[model samples]
Target: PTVVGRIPVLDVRPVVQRGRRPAKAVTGESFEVSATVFREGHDAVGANVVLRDPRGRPGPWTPMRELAPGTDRWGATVTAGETGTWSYTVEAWGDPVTTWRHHARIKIPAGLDTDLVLEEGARLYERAAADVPGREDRRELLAAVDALRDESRPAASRLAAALTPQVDAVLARHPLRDLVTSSDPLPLLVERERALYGAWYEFFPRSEGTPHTPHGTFRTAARRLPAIAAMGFDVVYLPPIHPIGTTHRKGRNNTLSATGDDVGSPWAIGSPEGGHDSIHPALGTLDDFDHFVTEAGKLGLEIALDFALQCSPDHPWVHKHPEWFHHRPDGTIAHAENPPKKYQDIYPIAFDADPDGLATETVRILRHWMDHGVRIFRVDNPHTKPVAFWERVIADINGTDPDVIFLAEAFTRPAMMATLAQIGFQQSYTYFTWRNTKQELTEYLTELSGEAASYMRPNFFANTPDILHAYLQHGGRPAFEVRAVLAATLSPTWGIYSGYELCENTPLREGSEEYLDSEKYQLKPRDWTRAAREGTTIAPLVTRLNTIRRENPALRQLRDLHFHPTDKEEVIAYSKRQGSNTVLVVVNLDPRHTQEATVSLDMPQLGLDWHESVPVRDELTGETYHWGRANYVRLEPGRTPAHVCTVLR
Candidate 1:
C-alpha cells in the first residue's frame, strides 16, 4: 500500500514562511524561506538541524543552537532562486530521546519584478536628491531615501543571483567598475532594465452558454469558432459534459420536483454510463470530446473542464465506494449542503476515505480525463477536501504532465484557501465577487498583487454559478460591462461563468442572494440573439472587450494593477501597463444613475506627467478622448457600458 503510513515517520515540524499553494510571482523575481528544528519531547536542551533542497542537496545546516527559554524555533532565509518548484526537508536531532524529520514543498509561478523597477527608480531619485542641496529639504529627501533603501535591501540580495550574468557581461565590455557610479548612469541602466522585464499574456477560454446543444458533434461548436475567435477569445470553456442524474431531478427555474421532459443541471454529475471520466451521451461520446479539444486547439482556444468532485445520488461511486461518503443513522449517504440550502442530488466525498483506495481512484479519474487532452481543470470546492490528499494527487498528476493547470474554486476562509494553494492547486478563485466598490477593489487588488504574491495567483471571477450579487442584479448592462472589464483586466488568469455575457442579472428575489433562474437548477438552453431590451445585442460589446484583453499586453500580465481614486463614489478607475502598452479602465458602479466624475490618473506610475493630455482610445467604440491627469468620464447608471481606454503615444 503506497499510503502515507507506509513511510517512516519524521519528527521535524518544518515551517515554510512564505509557503502556500500555487505560489505567486512575476517573471524574474525572488523571495526568501526559513526553517527551524526542535527537540521532540523535552522543553530544555539543544538540537541539530539539517536542511535539504528538492534535488536531495544538503544545505548549510544550523549549528547546534540552544532553544530559547520558552520556545524551540530556528530558521534560515531561502532565496527563491528561480521560477518553478522548490522543496526542502529538515531533520532534527537531540540526544537519544529526541529525533525526527519533516519535508515541505513550494511552487512559484512566473511574476513581475517590481523590485527591479524600485531599484532603478531609487537610483534616479537619489541623483535628484543629491542635486538639491538644502538642509531642511535634503533632510526630508534623506528620510525618503532611507525608506527606499530599506525597501531595496531585500530586493538587492535576491537580485544578486539574477544580476550575475548581466553584470558580468557589462564588466566584460567596460572593465571599469566605477562606470555604474557615474552621476547619470540610471537613465542608461533604467532603459536596459525596462527592456529586461518581458511581458506575456496568458489566455483562458470564455465560458458562456451556447444557443444550441452541440453534443455528439464537434462540428456544431466548430461552426461558431470563427465567431468566437473573431471576439478574440483564445479559450472556450465548457461546463461538465458528464451524464446528469435522473433521480430527484430539477426542472427550469428549479421546479425542484421535476417532470419527464426536464434536462437536469449538469453539475449533478454521474449516471449509469460513467462518472467524471465519461461525457454525457447526449453531448456526444469520448471521441467527440477529444475532437472538440483538437478543434479548439486548432482555433487557438484551449478547452477547460470543470473538475467537480461531488456526485449525484445515482452516481456509481455512491455504491462502489460507500466508505468514501458520510453516512447518516438511517444507513443512507448524506447529501451535500451549504447551511440553509441542500443539494439533494449531490454528495461530497470524504478525502480521508481508505487512503490507498481513495488515492488510486482519484488518480484514475484525473488520468482518464487527461487522456481526452484536457489540460486545465477548474476544481469545485477544493477546500472541502484534505490538503494532504490534494498535495499527493496534484504532485502525482503533474509529475506525468507538468503543464496541466488546476484552478481551485474554493471561496472559503482565507487560511483554508491559502492551504489549498500550498497543496498545489495552480490558480485560486478570489474575492472579486464582493470587491465591487472602488476602495474595496483597490485594497483587494493591492493585497493580491503585493503581499499575497508570495504564494497564490488569484484568478478573478466576476460571477460564478451560485452567486448573483447586487452589482450584477440591480445595475443591469452597465454592471455587467463593468464587472467583465474588472475580471478580464485584473488578472493574467480569469474567467466568467455562463450567462455573464447576456447580462442576466435578475436575482431570485429582494433580500435573497440567488439568480432568478439559476443554472444550478437546470441546464439552460440560451437564446444568444436576445438583446438588452427588444433591439440591441450585447455580443458586440463582449467581442470588443475580449479583443482589447487580447491585444494589450498590459491587460495580459497579472501584476501591473494600479487603482486611482475618482471623484464620484459610483465610479471606479484603474490602470494596467506593460512596456509602452497602457490601458486605463474606468467603471461606473451605479447601475441606475448617471455618474460624471473626475478620474485622477496616477501619471507617475505610468511614467507620464501631470496635466499632459494623453490620447485615450476607447476599445469598445474606438472613440478617442484626449484627457489630462484629471480626466472626466460620464457613465450612465443603468446598462451603460464601461470604458476601456488605451493611452496612445
Candidate 2:
C-alpha cells in the first residue's frame, strides 16, 4: 500500500481546447501530444503517448522525444488516422530495473569501443527479436546493432544522438512498463470526416410561421430547412427550443409590459411546457421534433440546438429547487443582469449550490436531445457557470460519446473565454462582430489563428440577434457585403442571424447593439420571397460565399489565415492555403465610399515566385488578373467591397 509514483502527468497538451471541450483533429491532420514527468531519485529511461484508435486498435507506441537537455518534458507528433474516438495516455518507466539485468550480461562492453558495444548488442537484440512478428519493430534494434558494429568508435567520448530511440525502443519492448509510471488516458474525439468547418444559419423555430400561425409550429419550420439547405448552409442553429416564461417577460422593444402579440424571449428559457428537457407544445410534440430533425438531416444539414443555461422564474427548477437560483433578501430570486441592463424575466443559475443535482439534470437534458439526433449544442453564456461544473458534465458526456460539440457564446474577458474552451467547449463565439478596423482585424486574426489556436476555436458571427454591430448600423448594404465576405472567409465556421441577410441594422437605440423589437421577444417571418424577388436581400451573395467555401479546401482550416499588408486602413486582405489550393480575400471596410489599396501578399504562401507574374482568378467577380507580389485593387462600396482570389497556377 505504501508503494508510490511521481505525480502522473499534471498537464497534458491537446487534451481540452482552452475552456471549451475536447481538442479536435481531422483524419489527415498531424498533431503533437505532450506531457512532462519528474521523479527525484529515478530516471525515466522511456516516455511515450500510448495512442489508441476508435475500434480498440493500438497504434505504434509514439515516443516523445525530449524537449531539451536537463528537462523532463517530452512530445510526439502523430498523424491522425481514424475518424472516430482516439485516445492516448502518457506513460513512463523509471529505468528498466527489473528485466534489464537479465539482458545486461550480453550488452556490457569491456572498454570504450563501438566494436564491443555492437557485438554484445547483437546478442541482446536476438533475445528481444525472436518473439516479435514484424520487421519494422525489429528494424530499430538492427539499426543500432549495425551502427555500432561497422564504424570505428569516435575518437572522443561516444556522445551519440541516434543511440537514444534505438536503445529506448529495444528496452521499450522488454516488459518495462507493466507496473511502472503512467497516467490515465485522455480521450481525443476525432471528427475529421465532418464538423471541423461549416456554414451556419440561425433562425427561430417560432419565426417559421405560416399564414394561419402567428408563431410558427415545428411542422412549418421543418419545411423551410430545405430552402436553408438550398442556400448551402451545412448547419441550421436553432435558438432555445424550450417553452418561454410569461412572468415579468420583457415586452416588445424590451419594455416591462404585457402585450397581446409579443412572444417572450426564447433565451429566458423554461415554462409549464417543460424546461430544457421538453420541447414547447406549440413547437409540436416529441414526434414532430424528431420529424424536423430527420427532415433537416435528409438535406445534409445538421441541426445545432441552442444550450442556454439560464432560466425564467417560472422554470421547473425555480419551484422545485429554489436553492439553484441566487436568492435576494425577502425570498426574491435575482434576475440576470449585465451592468446597464437587467433581464427581470431571466434568473441565472447558482452553479455552486446544489451542483450535484444541477449537473446530473443538465447532462440528462443534453443527452435527451442527443437521443433525438442533435449532434452539436451551441452553449449560450457558458462563462457565467463555474468551469468545474462544466468540466464534470462535459467530460461525462464526451467521455462516452465524443462527437457532441458545445459552442460557447461568452463575449467576456479574454482569459475567462479561453478557460471555457479549455474545459471542453468545441467552438466559441468571438469578438469578430466588433473588430472592424484594419489593425484590430489583423491583430485579432493573428491571435486567433496563432497563439490562441491550441485551445480556442473562433466561430465568427458577423451579427447575432442579441448584437447588431455599429458598422452594420452606419455602413448600409455594402457594409453587409463586406462583413459577410470577411466573416465567411476568415473563419472555417461562421454564422448569420436570421435578419443579417435582410440588412436589418437598425438598433433599439442609436448607440445600442441590441436589435429593434428583437426577435427574442417577437416573431416576424418577413417577406423573404418579396425581398428575393426585388433582389434586395443579400441571400444570393451568401449562397455564393457558402458555395465557394464548400468548393475550396483551404477555407475549412483555422490555422491557414494570413493577413496581408494594404496601404488603406479602409481595406483589409487575407489569404488561406492548403497544399496547392490557395485563396486571397480583400475587403473594403467602408460601405458608402469607394476604397483602393495596393495589395501586398505573402508570396511564398501564395505559391508564387516573386520574379514571375502569378495568374489568379477572382472568385467573386469571375475576372482574371496576373501580377507579381503587389497589385492595384480598387473597390466601390455598393459595387463590390471585397475580391476573393485564388491563384490559378
Candidate 3:
C-alpha cells in the first residue's frame, strides 16, 4: 500500500483549548499557529492550513512554511475573518510513495523498476478503493488500475516520467489516506464585547473624597471620575450601591461591635428601603446612579458594578423565600462562614431550595441593573456558588443581552476557575496578588495567553480592596511601581483598587494583605490633591501605563505573548504584538533590589531582520533606546523600575 504522511499537531496558539470542546478567539484578530508534520523519512513536505469560515465555506488554503531551516514545525498567522462560530484544521502531506519500486527511485529516479512499479502501484490504489466500501471508489480505482495495470512499461523512467503526473494524480483519487489532517477541527468562538481587554479602577462610590454627608453621593463621586479617566482606565468598578442592612452589622475594620455612626459593610445588602435593585439612599437615588453612568460614559468609562449574589439577613428574600436559605435545627438561617472568618451579617443563598425561583430572581436582578446602563459585572466570589447555576444565569443573560460582560472574581482551584469561564464568564480575577516572583509572573502570563485563555480572560489587579500583599508592604513605594506596570501590561484587562494610586501598603497585622483599617467597614479619606502635589503617588505612573496601553493596540490583546529571556532571575521580560505595533515590558520582580539584565527576544515574533533596530521609546521616562535582540534593562527599586516600551514609527 502507498505510504502517506502522519497528522500534524498544532503545538501552540489559535487553537488554545483542548478539553471537552475547542478553544475560542474573537473576530478581527490574528494569531500565530504552528504545527509539526512528520514523513517516514526526512523529505521535502508541504502542509497548509484549511480555514473554514462560520458558514462552513472553505476560505483559502493558507500555506504553512517550515519554522526553521530544517524543522518540521510549520507556522503561519491566520486571521479570524469575521464574527461567528468558525473552525480550522491542519492538513499535511510530503513525498508520496506507492510501493518499494516507487520508493527506491525517489527524487528523480532513472528507470529500472517501471514494470514492477506499475503492477504494484495498481494493486495499492485498488486496495485504497476497496477500503472505502463503495462503487464510486472502484470507478476511481479502475482508472488508476487501467493506467498502471495494463503493464506494458519496459521503457526508461525518464520516458515514463509522463506517467509520474498520472501516478501522482491517481493516488489522491484512490484515497491512499496519506494527506494527513488534525483529529478534529479546532472550533473557534468569537465574541468581541466580553473577550474584553481594558484597564479597571475600583473605587467605593460611597467614599470618593466627598465629606459633605460623611459618605460621598453619586453626583459627587461622578466628579472624581475624571481623575480616574485621566489615568486612562476604561472600566470604573464600584462596590455594591444597594441598601445596607442594619442587623448584625460589623463595625469599623470588620470588628462586629457597631455604633449609631458606624457604616456597615455595603456587602450586607438589603434593608426595608429595598433590595438589589434599589440604590443606597445616602449614595443617591437610582436616577442619580444613571447620571453617574452617563458621566462615566462621557469620559470613556463604562460602569462595572459589583454583582454579589448573597443577601443580608434583612433582605426581602429572607421573608418572601425563607426556604432559599440553609436551615439549622434551631430554626435560624445559616450565616456565610469561612471557618474562623464568619460573615454574620450575610447569608449564603441555598441554591437547591428554590432553584427555579432563585434562577429567575437572580437573573432578574442582573437584567434590572442592565436596564440602567450596566454592561460589565464584576461577580464577587463566584466560586462559592454552584457552577451549574452560574452556567445557566450567565448564559441566559448573554443570550438576551450579548453586550453584557461578566467578570468572575473567583480565586479558587484551576478546575473550578476554568469551568466557570467555560460556563460563560468573560473576564476573571487572577492570582496577580500572589504572583510576585519572576518565575511566577512568567508562568502565569503565559498560561493566561495559552489554553486558559480560550475561556478565562485574566484581569490582573495589582491589589484588590481585599488584598494588599506582604511584598507590597515591605518593598515600599518601589514595589507599587513594579506591580502596577507589571499588572497593567502583563494582562490586557488589568485593575487597581483606589488606594493603589496613593501607594497605600499598610496591613492590619504583621502578615495580612488587609489594610490596617480596611475601608470596607468605614470610609477612609484621601487627599488626592496632596498626594500629587507632594509627588508621593503612582497615579501619574498609572496614567502613563494606561496611556501607553491605549496608544498601542498590542497591549490590549491577550494571545500574542512572547516571553523573552533575562540574565537576572529578578527581571522578567515579555512582548506582545498586535499587527506591527509592539509593546515590550521588562519588570523587576524584586522591588527591594535594583536588578539589571539583557532581554533576548524571539526574532520571527518581532518580524525583525538580522542586526535590525526598531525605534523604541520608554513610555515611563520619555527615553529612547534602539531596541533589537539583547537590549539592556536596569530597574532601580527606589525610583522608576520598569519599561513599557512602545515601538514607534
Candidate 4:
C-alpha cells in the first residue's frame, strides 16, 4: 500500500526480522539479494542492487535480472569482500529508454507518429551523450542522434538507426532512470570464514596430563595440538582458564563437599590470584598461555577460549562490587542454579544493578584474550544474561575487532536462542544432541536450513560436558559414529567434546544426562597412547569424518541441505550440493539395530533424468554402489550404519 516514489519496491529480501537482525554472510560467499519491484503503468521499470560498507562507501551498482517474463521479481548475487556489517538495498527506477524503444518499434514502423517519435529519440540521444563520461560512448550516441535526424532516410530506416545493438548496450550500461526509488538499506553481517565452516574439538587443559603428571598445564596441553590438527579440526576450544574458587567447591560427581584434591569446575572462575584478566595459576602464567596459542597456531589450529560471565563466590568482584549480585532478604548472594541443579561455587552477575560496569568489564576481558591471540570465544550460558547486554557488548567488541567470533552456549528456549543469534553471536549450540529420531532430525534440520539459516548459524555438538544423551549412553560405539556422521555432515560447523573419541558414555545416574564423574568436576585424563594401540577409540572414525568434511565443498554449506523420502522411520536420507560437488547422506538413527529402507532420491535436484543411474562411493567404509531414483539400502549398527556417498556422474 505504501509507495515512496513512482516505482514501488516491496518485499526486499535477505532481510531478517525487517532489518532488525542482520542477514548472515561470510567472506567471499555469494548469496542472492532480491526484491519485488514494479510501476503502476507499462513503463518497463527495472531494478538493481546496491551495496555499501560499514563506512557508507558504495560498491558498483549490480544490475538485477528479472527472474521470469512478467514476474517483476528481480534478483542479483553479491559477495562481501571482507568482514563487517554491510548495507544492501534494492533500487527501482523507470527505464525510460526501454519504454521509448518499445513504443517506437510499434508506432514508427506503422508510419504513425514517426516524426514525433524520431524527434523524441534524438533528444534522448543528445542528453545521454552529454551525460556519458567515455569519449567512445559519447561519439556513438552523437552519431546515432545524427542518423535519427537524417531527412533522406525512410521512417523504418530512421527507427533502425536509433535501435542498433551497440546503442542498446550503451543505454543498458547507463539507463536514463526516472523517479529513482530505493528500499531501506538492509544490514548484512559478513563474518569470517570460520563462522560458516569449521570443525571444533573441545577439551579441558587440566585433563590433558599423562599418568605421571598430576594435572595438565599449558605446556602439557600444547602437546595435544599436533594430534588434534591431524584429526582435521580447525578450532580447539578450551574451557575457562581463569582462577577457580575454593569456597564451596563441589567434589567429583558434583558432591556437596569437596576433598582437598578436587579441582572444582573450571566455570567457577575467580579467586584471590586474579579475575577474568588473570590465567589460572595451575594452568601456567600468561607467558605459558601465549606459548600454547603460538604452538596451536603453528599447527593450523585457532584456540577459542571460554568466556563465562558469572563469577566464583571467592572472586574479588564479590567483595569489591557486592551490589553486582542478587542478595536474599537474609543478605546472602544468590548462587547460580537451574531448578533442581545448583552451582554453589558460582555467583551469577546481576547485570541490571551494574549494567555499565559489567559491559566495560566484559569488553576488557574479551580484549585481554584478544591481545593474547585469541579471536574466538565460546560464551557459557549467554541466555542467562539480558539480551540487550549481549547486543551492546557484542556490538562494542565487533566494532573494533571485526574478526572476533562468539559462539553462544545457550541451549534454552527457541526464541531466546534465535534472539541471541539475531543480535550478534556468530554461532550457537543447537538441539542436535537430543534430536535422535527420524522425524525429529528431519523437522529440526529443515528448520535450521530454512529462514533461520540467514542469521542463526548452528554449531551442532553431538556431546558436551554437561550433556551425555541417553542415545550415546546405550547405543555404544556405533551410536557415537552415527551422531558424528550426522553432526559432521548435517551442519558445516560441528563439535565433539574430548571424551567422545574414547566413547565415554556412563552417566551420573540412571536417567540423568550428566556424565559419571563429569570432567567439569574432576580431571579425567585420557590415555591416547593406549586407545591407539588397542583401537578401542572412535578417534579414527572422527578423523575420517573430519577428512570427508574438509574434502567436500557440498558438506560446507547450510542452505543446500535437502531431505529425500524414506520408507522406514529409523532411516533418514539427505543430500547437499555446491556446483559440481554433490554429497548424499543416509543415516540409520537406530544405533542398536540394523535399519533398512527404500530411499527415493529427488532426481531433479541432482540434475538427472528419471531413468538415470549414478555411481556413488561411500566415503566412510570405501564401499561402492549404483543408485537411481528408488534405491534400497541396508545399514548394520556395528558395521556400516551410514553412507556418506559422493555422486559420480
Q: Which candidate is the best by lDDT?
A: 4
Best candidate according to TM-score: 4
Model 4, range 284-317, lDDT digits (tens) per residue? 9999999999999999999999999999988999
Off by over 4 Å in 4: 39-47, 53-76, 93-180, 622-626
Give the range where candidate 4 is weakest over 10 consecutive residues by summed lDDT: 1-10
Q: Model 1 compared with the native: what TM-score?
A: 0.69
Residue-wise lDDT of candidate 3 within 1-649, one digit each (tens)? 3233254454544444353444566666666556776666644465667778879987554767788876777877677766666777777664344333345455325554666666665665566666555565556556756655554643343224324554445444443445565534777666674355788999987787455576888988998899999998889989999999989998988888679878889989888889998998988898899999999999999999988888888888889888888889998887897556689999988888789998999889999999989988989889889999988898799778766788999887888888888777888888888988888877887788876776678888889878889989998888888888888888888889988988898999987778988989998778899999999888888998888888888887888888888898988888899877988888888888888888886766777875778788888889998977778878787677788788887
lDDT of 1 by residue, 409-439 (tens): 8888989887886667667878889998878
Candidate numbers sorted by lDDT from highest down: 4, 3, 2, 1
**On lDDT, who's better, 1 or 2?**
2
Please give the CA lDDT of all the candidate structures: 0.61, 0.78, 0.78, 0.89
Candidate 3 residue 272 Cα shift, in angstroms, is 1.1
lDDT tens readout by residue for model 2, 1-649: 3233554554667656432354666665555677776565543455677778877777876777778877777778665686776777777665433234323333443344445544555555555555555677667655654554545555112324224665566656653343356676677766643445888899988888988876788898998898789888988899999888899888888888758767888888888878998888778889899999999999999999998888988888888898888887788877888767788999999977788888888889999999999988998888878888877888899877778877888989998888887777778889999899889989898988874666667889899888898899999888898889988999888989987888998999998999987888788677778888999989988998998888787887777678888889888888997767888888988888888889887787676666678788888779989867898999988888788888786
Q: How far does residue 577 in candidate 2 sit from its true spot (Å)? A: 1.2
Superior candidate under lDDT, 1 versus 4: 4
TM-score of each: 0.69, 0.78, 0.83, 0.86
Estimate the overall C-alpha local distance difference test score of candidate 4.
Answer: 0.89
Question: Cα deviation of 403 in candidate 3 (Å)?
Answer: 2.0
The candidate with the higher TM-score, 1 or 4, is 4
The deviation in Å at residue 420 for candidate 4 is: 1.3
